[PDB]
Design a protein around this ligand. Structure first.
Ligand code: 2VF
Ligand code: 2VF
Ligand code: CA
Ligand code: CA
Ligand code: CA
Ligand code: CA
Ligand code: CL
Ligand code: CL
Lengths: 361, 366
């Protein structure tokens, strides 16, 4: 196996395939075949593959090498460097200028594959749209809940919309985007680690994303990268049951002003229960916090609100996470009563909605 | 006690006086800042009983004298969290301190200013003034080589040595050494003291980059640094420091000069395949050429060759590549000078253009 490739063509692929990797699971599979260098990394649940066209002379074959070490060496070489690689006995030689490295290998035959599977649902969308969908909701996924089905993100197709849902059983995020195709009605749960890799492969370019979903797998193809993940089992909750039935009380406020006010008030909230009380009244919002030491914060903001007066308590971190994810000018808070969930949206778009539960203070 | 002060006029002082505060105070009031309004000035003080920082703020709006203490982290976070250019009005009400700005209001718990501790009184024996850039350079050149929590407590800090008209800093962790020496345009007694590492970092960070000169006063057991509105005081480390003179190699006659970034990048690549614990790399030096090799227990191998300026006898030497990279990162120079003797002697490293800072690293066999 021999190839010679510019650093610039090798670096982004290596970065992508090597990022998550950690004995042969800590190596990248390199294969020279059909005019192409393929690089693959896996943790047995998901797999990233990059293809790189070889325009210089090359020789076929495959091996595996320590991913981090190989990435670090390539990244450490100067801009414009050419990287020549070849196999020698049990080692992989890497030469660039007068820099030389000999790395250990494990056999390509020992490198594990995901089980074969069949595509049942397929669609295309812009990368920016997938990016928006994941970024809108990803912060609301559980991390290591014993309900495994929450440690990931629902991807749902309905009509012409691709929708993401994430919840940790305390708060929820949902985002729907039209993608201009007639889609079957379907949903799957992508594990949180898979969601992070998928997000990270979105380069910021114009190449559309192609998505393939099977009964137990999802695949995303963008440019010369192919990501594959296993899916999570279990019944994901229904966001329509979490969204309030009819949140007819509508408050609108500047997103950054609201964020700042909540973050200041939070300073004098209980460290155990970092909650704040909201008093909504005609065109005014009052936020208060207090703690065991009898310390007290109060913030008063102008808002647009016509509706009955009410008081409701929230976890401040959940509201700040939402406001930070919206990145908007104005927010709409849609209220029911003092003991029911609140829905929050960008005042200028219904494309994403967030649900937070009231908090006993 | 009443004052009304622009947010920004409070933030830099608050940053400074919060630095001494230890994570788990020995007394409740050690988690607080002392606030005093007197003769047109707000003073703020934070301490950990070993060192103290005081900041002064001129009060141009109406004020009322008095003193109290408030929780440092909460008061800072409130001031920082208020909007750009906010006016911050503070007044003492019972054992609460009220803070208001716009339509934001906060009530903080206080502790009596009478309980706020002071450092022991002392007399200044050695004093000098210098540009704050000179002090910044001295500390930044050497700080990375101080020990961290060594039982050899005299290493957990930095020596400050006065001689003639020069101020010198030295730091070592008992493995590698950094020294920097700068003239300061004032005749000084021959003296040296050890500043504890926490104090060194506080001192470094009180230097804002501006044109205010720094006045240093050294006592038998204490040091004080005054710049602008800020006054820092620390105990000294009561120990004996090693002599840096004895570790500098004698008459190193084989000087290698190379571009700093080129040399740094070659070592950084070679380091990838060095032993993770002991980090040894080998240099082979020859006419205008350097070869660096590394290998690890998995028998992986790196080799770098680069052009350098070198006319000495051919030799080999090994070093800890982590120590050499730390030096190159501290130097941030155009060209570096490695002053070599032989395979069983230390190396002295300097900016090729300046003898002000020098670093010594020990040889390794492989
Ligand atoms: N945590 C609860 O009691 C109910 N609850 C649940 C969820 C939820 C979400 C919100 Cl915003 C608000 C409340 C929510 C999602 C997970 C559900 C489950 O156990 O499968 C339960
Ligand atoms: N001489 C020694 O055993 C190690 N050593 C020591 C020092 C040292 C410095 C260098 Cl660069 C290199 C090596 C160094 C200074 C601190 C000394 C002590 O124990 O008080 C010991
Ligand atoms: Ca092997
Ligand atoms: Ca939606
Ligand atoms: Ca704006
Ligand atoms: Ca109800
Ligand atoms: Cl604000
Ligand atoms: Cl070892």
């Amino acid at each position: 196996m021999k190839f010679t490739v510019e650093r610039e063509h090798l670096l982004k692929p290596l970065q992508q395939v090597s990022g998550p990797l950690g004995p042969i699971l800590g190596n990248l599979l390199l294969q020279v075949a059909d005019g192409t260098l393929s690089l693959t990394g896996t943790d047995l649940e998901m797999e990233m593959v990059a293809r790189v066209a070889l325009v210089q002379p090359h020789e076929p074959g495959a091996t595996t090498v320590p991913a981090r070490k190989f990435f670090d060496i390539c990244r450490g070489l100067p801009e414009g460097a050419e990287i020549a690689v070849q196999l020698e006995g049990e080692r992989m030689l890497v030469r660039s200028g007068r820099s030389r490295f000999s790395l250990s290998t494990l056999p390509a035959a020992d490198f594990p594959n995901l089980d074969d599977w069949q595509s049942e649902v397929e669609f295309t969308l812009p990368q920016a749209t997938m990016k928006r969908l994941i970024e809108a909701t990803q912060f609301s996924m559980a991390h290591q809940d014993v309900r495994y089905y929450l440690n990931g993100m629902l991807f749902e197709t309905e009509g012409e919309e691709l929708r993401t849902v994430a919840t940790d059983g305390h708060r929820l995020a949902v985002c729907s985007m039209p993608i201009g195709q007639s889609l079957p009605s379907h949903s799957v749960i992508v594990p949180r680690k898979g969601v992070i890799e998928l997000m990270r492969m979105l380069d910021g370019g114009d190449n559309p994303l192609r998505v393939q979903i099977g009964s137990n797998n999802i695949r995303a193809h963008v440019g010369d990268f192919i990501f594959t993940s296993k899916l999570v089992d279990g019944r994901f909750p229904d966001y329509r049951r979490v969204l309030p039935k009819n949140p007819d009380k509508h408050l609108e406020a500047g997103c950054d002003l609201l964020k700042q006010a909540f973050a200041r008030a939070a300073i004098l909230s209980n460290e155990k229960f970092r909650g704040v009380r909201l008093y909504v009244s005609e065109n005014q919002l009052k936020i208060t916090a207090n703690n065991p030491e009898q310390e007290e914060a109060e913030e008063i903001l102008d808002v647009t609100y016509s509706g009955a007066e009410m008081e409701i308590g929230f976890n401040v971190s959940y509201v700040l996470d939402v406001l930070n994810a919206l990145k908007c000018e104005n927010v709409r808070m849609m209220l029911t009563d003092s003991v029911s969930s609140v829905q929050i949206e960008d005042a200028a778009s219904q494309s994403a909605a967030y649900v937070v539960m009231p908090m006993r203070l």
